[PDB]
């Protein structure tokens, strides 16, 4: 399946971060840090590059909080 676009916005839609395509172009990653007292985040994944009816494309999404080793987690999903 073709690589979709990734971005991060708050609850109102204000953009905060955008996804970077790695040199081994098989994944897209994102990173952010908290400054405000309370931050509510929304993760956007979209593949509407054009109007192609590709069909049943399926992707794997991995997310983590205070987990910089997301590339090689090894442990099963912990915490919450």
């Amino acid at each position: 399946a073709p690589l979709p676009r990734l971005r991060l916005t708050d609850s109102g839609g204000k953009p905060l971060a955008f996804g970077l395509i790695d040199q081994p172009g098989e994944s897209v990653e994102l990173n952010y840090t908290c400054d405000q007292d309370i931050c509510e985040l929304v993760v956007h994944v979209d593949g509407t590059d054009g109007q192609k009816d590709s069909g049943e494309a399926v992707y794997r999404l991995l997310v983590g909080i205070n987990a910089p080793n997301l590339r090689e987690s090894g442990q099963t999903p912990v915490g919450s």
Partner: protein, 316 residues
Amino acid sequence: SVFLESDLVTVGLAVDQIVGVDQRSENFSVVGTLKLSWHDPKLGFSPDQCGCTVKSFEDASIRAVAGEINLPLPSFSFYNQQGNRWSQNQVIFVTPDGRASYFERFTVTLQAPDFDFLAYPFDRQKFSIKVDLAVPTNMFIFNEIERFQQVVGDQLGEEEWVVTSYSQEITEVPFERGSTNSRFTTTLLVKRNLEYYILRIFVPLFLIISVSWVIFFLKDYGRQLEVASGNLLVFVAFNFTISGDLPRLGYLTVLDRFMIVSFCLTAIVVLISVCQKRLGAVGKQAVAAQIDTWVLVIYPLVYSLYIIWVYLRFFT
């Protein structure tokens, strides 16, 4: 544009089901869906007010909501509505731009004096649905039609009324306190199921008429009289048996006229039969034979001429 302009409204309507028709009172009832869309920066909005991208109002009319936010909105009405309207899934929702839209699923009864049943059962009618804006044309105007569904939707099984074609149109009409308002009209052209009436009424009638026609070949005039008398009672019995498919409107249709003519001819058969019996009694059998030949030639010509006359005077 130095001159401040008007607001443009997009509108759409779809019919799910015709649920009834009152031919005496002249009204019909219908189930359907209504959709309105427009854009107004005074409805603008800042997301940090709620942390949200969509503001909405539920189970309220456009008039009610206008009275809460104290800004003018495109309120409407159904022009021919009789009594109250049942509504479901009623909602208004708005974006930070001010792009707004309204949705309703409705069941409503509409007056229709344009109905005309003279040609019954061969009659054809129009079911028209009219939506009027309740505000002047310089404030809001219907500008575009949206086809969000099939305008008339399909349903399993048969229907009493068959839609032959439809259309949808925007016009403008005069308004109280002057000026003009926009109108959106949907019209369905409809006819009845003809096979039902044909097979249920006309073939048995034709056989009954044939029964009174064929008896004139007999030369025993007592048997002819008795069979004529019995056939008249059979005719009356069948007429009151089909009386359920005979609407009581207070004026004559094609079918009532045909029934009256048939009854009159059936009774004249009995009268001629009594005359021929007397003639045979007195010993003038030749005159009775000649009357038999005349009746056998004449009666189908009379029926055919009456049918031609009815066709000329009611269908052209």
